[PDB]
Amino acid sequence: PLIVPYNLPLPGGVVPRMLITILGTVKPNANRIALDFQRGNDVAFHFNPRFNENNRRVIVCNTKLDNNWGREERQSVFPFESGKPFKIQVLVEPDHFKVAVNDAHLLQYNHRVKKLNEISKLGISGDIDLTSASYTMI
Numbered sequence: 001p002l003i004v005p006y007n008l009p010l011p012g013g014v015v016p017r018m019l020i021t022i023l024g025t026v027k028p029n030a031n032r033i034a035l036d037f038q039r040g041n042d043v044a045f046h047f048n049p050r051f052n053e054n055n056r057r058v059i060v061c062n063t064k065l066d067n068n069w070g071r072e073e074r075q076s077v078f079p080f081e082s083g084k085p086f087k088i089q090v091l092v093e094p095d096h097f098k099v100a101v102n103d104a105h106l107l108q109y110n111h112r113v114k115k116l117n118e119i120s121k122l123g124i125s126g127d128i129d130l131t132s133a134s135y136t137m138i
C-alpha cells in the first residue's frame, strides 16, 4: 500500500478531461477521509467523507483560501463503508469537478479556484489503505 497521507503531483495543474482515479479500502471503524486538490497553500477542492458527524455520515466539500474555509457543500449520499474497497473517480470538467464513487455519480463541485493549471497537487488523507492514485486524459 501507498503511504497515507499521500501527495500526488498533478504536473501543470488540472485541465478539463483529466480523470483522477483513487483506489483503496476504508479502514475498519473509519472516522474520516479527505482529498485535497491544492493550489499552493490553498485548497481548491476538499472532498471529506465524515463517518460520524453527530451520528450521521456525510460528505463535506469546501475550498480553503488564505487559511480560511469557505461555504461548505454537503452530500448525504454516502457511498463509503468501513472495511470495504472503493474507487473514487474525479473528472475535471470545464466548470466543476465531477465525482463518481464505485462507478456511480456522486456530486459535482463548481470551480471556485479558477486557475486550474495552478492546482498542481492532490493530497489523500485519512482512514484508508491506499492502493493507487493516478491520472489520465479521457
Ligand SMILES: Cc1ccc(S[C@@H]2O[C@H](CO)[C@H](O)[C@H](n3cc(-c4ccc(F)c(F)c4)nn3)[C@H]2O)cc1
Pocket: 032, 033, 034, 046, 048, 060, 061, 062, 069, 070, 072, 125, 126, 127
Ligand atoms: C469556522 C470553522 C469551524 C470548524 C471547521 S471544521 C473543518 O471543516 C473543513 C471543511 O469545511 C475541513 O473539513 C477541515 N479539515 C478536515 C481535515 C482532515 C484532515 C485529515 C484527514 F484525514 C481528514 F479526513 C480530514 N483537515 N481540515 C475541518 O477541520 C471549519 C470552519
Ligand SMILES: [Cl-]
Pocket: 032, 048, 050
Ligand atoms: Cl473531518
